[PDB]
């Protein structure tokens, strides 16, 4: 399987600098030419640079030379893309991708990474329980949950009992306020209110300000 | 500089439907043009390279044809999967311009009411001096809803957050409502009232405090 894994992501402030990393692999990284393209949000694709892996050459679109530098580790399979001067246009999710020679259509892409440029500072969530209730739901099923309130920016991920429960979850997109914080919620459908032997933490991942949060939902 | 100009700019169509997405290039580019499917916060998936030629895996229904300066994507038998935004590019010439995507939306599917789930403030959040009633919307279709809240008998304006609806894994869709409280508030009603209208129809939870 070729995997193209990057990191890096997160917020910086205008004027700020970040370093985003695409770690390759499944195939052999100098036969390639990787590359960088991004999406602001709500918006299409521009490509933003390419680099030949063997020599280090880099060739940039015109709105980043001078401002954007890629480098290549060939060691670890891994390529690099330094941002200087960031400002808030270059809000968006940039993605990795890999091409073959002259051709530059992109078989292979990363998962893409969040790029936020902004005044305002990273905040980690208030990760509260909502205590299990039948007369919560329409449906007559039982339902518990966790809100994850005031964090910023984007992505919070969440999941259960660190991955063993998936069954019956629900986890809502969120919620910008006008507090310029997000929110949102998971919820998992159970029996009933009254929760016996079974355990149910909410694992709360908010990488951009380094935050976990695992709380634990029991009855009121 | 070299311009990808898709058309229609979004389409709404039915399960078994053939779609026809055109791509218009401002100069002369052969046959060095690919197509890509985007699915909401996934990457794109390449379709089609050389304006004609399947990807691996791709399936028969997804066609491309044409060169020169008008290429055309074709989906033969739309199934409930292939909703997506899909770019064409041009991939020769730097900087190997993407179209801007044409937006292909679901329609004519099963009307479906929402499922509502609504949850009072947490002893912890009105511990911290807080309070959030949390109002979650599951297994709408199609894709609107409005929300009002009321306390006892009364709709209530401020401390409103409401997403824009978003397709579930089912093709169905979610939304959330909260709504921002002191505790004194909250504990000052009888009761609160989420009220989601869908089509016309509402359906409701109130809760209580303690």
């Known amino acids: 399987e070729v995997q193209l894994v990057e990191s890096g992501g997160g917020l910086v402030q205008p004027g700020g600098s970040l370093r985003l990393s695409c770690a390759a692999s499944?195939?052999?990284?100098?036969?390639?030419?990787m590359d960088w393209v991004r999406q602001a949000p709500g918006k299409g694709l521009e490509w933003v640079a390419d680099?030949?892996?063997?020599?280090?050459?880099?060739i940039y679109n015109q709105r980043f030379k001078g401002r954007f530098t890629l480098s290549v580790d060939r060691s670890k399979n891994t390529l690099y893309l330094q941002m200087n001067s960031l400002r808030a246009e270059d809000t968006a999710v940039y993605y990795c991708?890999?091409?073959?020679?002259?051709?530059?259509?992109?078989?292979?892409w990363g998962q893409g990474t969040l790029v936020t440029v902004s005044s305002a500072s990273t905040k980690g969530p208030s990760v509260f329980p909502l205590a299990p209730s039948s007369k919560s739901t329409s449906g007559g099923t039982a339902a518990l949950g966790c809100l994850v309130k005031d964090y910023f920016p984007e992505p919070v991920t969440v999941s259960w009992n660190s991955g063993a429960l998936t069954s019956g979850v629900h986890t809502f997109p969120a919620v910008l306020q006008s507090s310029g914080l997000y929110s949102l919620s998971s919820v998992v459908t159970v029996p009933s209110s009254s929760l016996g032997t079974q355990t149910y933490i909410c694992n709360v991942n908010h990488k951009p300000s380094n935050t976990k949060v695992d709380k634990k939902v029991e009855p009121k | 500089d070299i311009q990808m100009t898709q058309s229609p700019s979004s389409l709404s169509a039915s399960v078994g439907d053939r779609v026809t997405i055109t791509c218009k290039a401002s100069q002369d580019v052969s046959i060095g043009v690919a197509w890509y499917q985007q699915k909401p916060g996934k990457a794109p998936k390449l379709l089609i390279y050389?304006?004609?030629y399947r990807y691996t895996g791709v399936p028969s229904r997804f066609s491309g044809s044409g060169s020169g300066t008008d290429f055309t994507l074709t989906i033969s038998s739309l199934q409930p999967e292939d909703f997506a935004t899909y770019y064409c590019?041009?991939?020769?010439?730097?900087?190997?311009?993407f179209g801007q995507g044409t937006k292909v939306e679901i329609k004519g599917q099963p009307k479906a009411a929402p499922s509502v789930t609504l949850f009072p403030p947490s002893s912890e959040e009105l511990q911290a001096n807080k309070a959030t009633l949390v109002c979650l919307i599951s297994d709408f279709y199609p894709g609107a809803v409005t929300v009002a809240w009321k306390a006892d008998s009364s709709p209530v304006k401020a401390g409103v957050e409401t997403t824009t609806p978003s397709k579930q894994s089912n093709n169905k869709y979610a939304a959330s409502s909260y709504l921002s409280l002191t505790p004194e508030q909250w504990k000052s009603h009888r009761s609160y009232s989420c009220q989601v209208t869908h089509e016309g129809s509402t359906v409701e939870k109130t809760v209580a405090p303690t």
């Open positions: 050389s304006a004609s």
């Open positions: 680099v030949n892996p063997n020599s280090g050459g880099s």
């Open positions: 499944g195939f052999t990284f100098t036969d390639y030419t």
């Open positions: 991708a890999r091409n073959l020679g002259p051709s530059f259509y992109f078989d292979y």
């Open positions: 590019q041009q991939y020769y010439i730097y900087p190997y311009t």
